[PDB]
C-alpha cells in the first residue's frame, strides 16, 4: 500500500524542481519592483530586499498582505495596478498551476499501481 507513495512523492519533487524556474522568474520580477517602488533607497540592494523578502515567498500563501496596500497624484493611480498584477493575477496563477501538476502526477502514478 505504501510503496507507490514514495515514488509518486519523488515524481512530485521533480515537478517542483521544474516549477522552480518559473517561480524564480516571478520572484525576481516582482521583488525588484517592490523594492524600487515601495520605498526609496536602502543599505544597498540586500538591505531593501531582505526588508520584505519574507512576505512574497511565504506570507502570500500564509496570509493576505494587509500593511502593503496601506504603505503604498500619478503615483497613487499607478500603485494599484502594480500590486493587482503582482499578487492576485500571477501568484495565484502560478500556485494553482503547480497544484494542477501535482494532481496529474499522482493520478498517473496511482493509475498504474501494482506494476511500479
Write out the residues near a second copy by the rule CB under 8 A. Answer: 1-2, 5, 8-9, 12-13, 16, 18-19, 21-22, 54, 57-59, 61-65, 69, 87-88, 92-93, 96-97, 99-107, 110
Q: How far is the CB of 74 from a second copy (least distance, A)?
A: 18
Q: Which helix (H) or strand (E) holds 112?
A: none
Nearer to a second copy, 36 or 96 (CB): 96
Report the distance separating Cα 14 and Cα 3, nearest Å.
Answer: 18
Nearer to a second copy, 10 or 42 (CB): 10
Nearer to a second copy, 81 or 107 (CB): 107
Cα–Cα distances in angstroms (integers) from residue 8 to residues 29, 67, 95, 103, 116, in the given order: 32, 40, 19, 11, 10
User: In this structure, what C-alpha cell is assigned to residue 53?
Assistant: 523578502
Amino acid at each position: 500500500n505504501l510503496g507507490p507513495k514514495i515514488i509518486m512523492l519523488q515524481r512530485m519533487l521533480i515537478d517542483v524542481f521544474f516549477f522552480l524556474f518559473l517561480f524564480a522568474v516571478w520572484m525576481v520580477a516582482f521583488g525588484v519592483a517592490r523594492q524600487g517602488i515601495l520605498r526609496q533607497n536602502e543599505q544597498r540592494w540586500r538591505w531593501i530586499f531582505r526588508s520584505v523578502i519574507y512576505e512574497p515567498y511565504l506570507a502570500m500563501f500564509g496570509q493576505v498582505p494587509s500593511d502593503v496596500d496601506s504603505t503604498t497624484r500619478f503615483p497613487e493611480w499607478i500603485t494599484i495596478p502594480l500590486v493587482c498584477i503582482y499578487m492576485l493575477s500571477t501568484n495565484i496563477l502560478l500556485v494553482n498551476l503547480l497544484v494542477a501538476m501535482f494532481g496529474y502526477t499522482v493520478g498517473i502514478v496511482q493509475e498504474n499501481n501494482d506494476q511500479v
